[PDB]
Amino acid sequence: VQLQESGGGLVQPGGSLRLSCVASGSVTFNSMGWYRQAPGKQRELVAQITAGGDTHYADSVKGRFTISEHRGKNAVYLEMHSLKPEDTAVYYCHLQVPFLGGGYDYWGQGTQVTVSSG
Amino acid sequence: GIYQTSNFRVQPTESIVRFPNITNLCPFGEVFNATRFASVYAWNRKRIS
Ligand SMILES: *[C@@H]1O[C@H](CO)[C@@H](O)[C@H](O)[C@H]1NC(C)=O
Numbered sequence: 828v829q830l831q832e833s834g835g836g837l838v839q840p841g842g843s844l845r846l847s848c849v850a851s852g853s854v855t856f857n858s859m860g861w862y863r864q865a866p867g868k869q870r871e872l873v874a875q876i877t878a879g880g881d882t883h884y885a886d887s888v889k890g891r892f893t894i895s896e897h898r899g900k901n902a903v904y905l906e907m908h909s910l911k912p913e914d915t916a917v918y919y920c921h922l923q924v925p926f927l928g929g930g931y932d933y934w935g936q937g938t939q940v941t942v943s944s945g
Numbered sequence: 946g947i948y949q950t951s952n953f954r955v956q957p958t959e960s961i962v963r964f965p966n967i968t969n970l971c972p973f974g975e976v977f978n979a980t981r982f983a984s985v986y987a988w989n990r991k992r993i994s
């Protein structure tokens with residue numbers, strides 16, 4: 828339970844929009860992860876940001892996603908641009924909350940985003 | 946003098962009920978609208994949450 832997320836806009840390929848994991852308060856973390864899954868394929872990774880400053884991206888998403896962390900509103904924002912129809916999926920925010928030394932990410936919450944010309 | 950006659954109160958205009966819809970769509974189309982269905986012995990159950 829604890830945290831939560833929803834929202835998102837359906838846009839045409841080549842657009843730009845800001846996915847936001849809507850904040851649920853101040854939570855202890857060291858790694859925020861944007862992650863995407865579409866039916867018919869293995870659930871794949873998008874990008875991780877680190878409280879220290881480390882930033883990792885998947886190989887297929889270069890130059891199209893920008894990840895940023897806002898510690899006042901404690902939310903991670905993904906600005907997505909130059910879209911192609913392979914991003915049609917639902918996007919999840921996985922946490923890092925230390926459980927025994929890390930684990931139990933709260934990626935239950937999802938945001939369905941489909942990019943299409945029609 | 947000054948006398949107190951009655952008491953005045955504001956009445957609610959419209960009643961509003963909201964529970965959190967907040968979620969994803971739901972995996973139903975892939976079950977009912979699926980092209981192929983499993984056999985009656987290799988049973989296909991899809992999990993929904
Ligand atoms: C819940 O909200 C999302 C977006 O806010 C919407 O896509 C979805 O259809 C809503 N659910 C219902 C049952 O209306």
Ligand SMILES: *[C@@H]1O[C@H](CO)[C@@H](O)[C@H](O)[C@H]1NC(C)=O
Nearest residue numbers: 973974975976977978979980
């Ligand atoms: C199955 O798909 C068709 C066309 O995409 C649609 O009209 C129909 O409503 C779908 N089935 C259900 C149960 O929604």
